[PDB]
Amino acid sequence: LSLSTAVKELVENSLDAGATNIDLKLKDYGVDLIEVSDNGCGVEEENFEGLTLALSSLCALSDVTISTCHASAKVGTRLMFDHNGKIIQKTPYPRPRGTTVSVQQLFSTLPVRHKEFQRNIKKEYAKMVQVLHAYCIISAGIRVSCTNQLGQGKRQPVVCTGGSPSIKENIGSVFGQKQLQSLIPFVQLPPSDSVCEEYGLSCSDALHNLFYISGFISQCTHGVGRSSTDRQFFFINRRPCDPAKVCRLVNEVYHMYNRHQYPFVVLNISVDSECVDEEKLLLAVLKTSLIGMFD
Template structure:
């Protein structure tokens, strides 16, 4: 487009780094999205323990640790590359996992300082991996770690100054969204113990959320919202329609499936 003075600037392609940052900002929309992506990765890796550590409501640091399978050495480079994933062998894997575009870690690299400590289930010694904003592995050193992965994000959105300022200004609105997202995963993730702590400044670390790893969704609801909440819950029971109801709805002679809902 021509400027007000009438001189036309040449139309040029946006440089790759800016494109990566712009697109990443559209994948990771908020702190809650970042936490969601990391927690999903942990659960998809078969974790039974997921620990979310926040500092200053997540503005300074977000760390998600799990006891899942861990990352294999041949995947260290591809871990943070765009559209790379170890979860997809064939299309049906989209149904059996939380879904993915292979963009989360790549986008988080562009928006924060990202490091990973991981130890694959087949090895004894872990590795600490540091990535640059393009998702390239810049540092790799042996590091003791239990089987599983810890992803650490520092200063989310600081590579987008205007977005970062807005993010810090609105943290009081952002923080409850993280808790809401975590509550959802706490409820549906049976057999997974999820804990979230927050530390303000040099203050004490407080536990914000904690489930016990129960296999019952009812127990999870009690752990998240308190035992009082359980008193108002009504179990959902499926009862197949009897003959007269079938007739009313014109379903005579139709085989109605036993489990109508799942």
């Protein structure tokens, strides 16, 4: 559990509640406050007790306050929790439909981790930004935002998507239109014979292809790439992940055309549940498709 994993869990809870609006509010990069507010279905009053029987772990590590309102409820409710997940306070609370989870002073009950958190805040915040950006990019139709407030300073916007139906416009929201001008869409091709022979694939192995790849990548032109892999986002069935062999292959094929730079990557891999726990076939489709794009 880290700042990034705490944010990942709260974002996923909002997504599962069916939110179209998700606001991440940070104070001191999240050392002081991590707050996720959404307009999802909210929580019914009957299930208030069972919320901490992910959330239970956060209660053990921080001061957690939750406001929620179910559509079947007239008014919302405000809940305070002790570190055993027990409800300290339960009061009516006027708020729109949805849920707000407030994580105050993460790791305060564990002074060693709290200190490592503060000492390493730049790296932990950068990791959290990666998680935030991945969800911003892939969550078409959902407005995702983040703000941060440092010390006595004013609250500052960090990122905000517009609820657009395309990953491309979400990329533009996150990184600006300049980033889009250097990208090409992924174009899927059947795996060629040489690449199949390279991965030891028969004609029968490639005939039952059920991988659907989409997304965007930097053009391989000399100079238009990036200095590092700071903007590489991989998804399997829309969920952010880090596939080693796939990521390895994408960088390898790109360096065949631009050895001194790294590409921007947004790549979603859609596949049937039977193939989830034929990676060779996937890598064959990827290399063949990228070669066709870069030639």
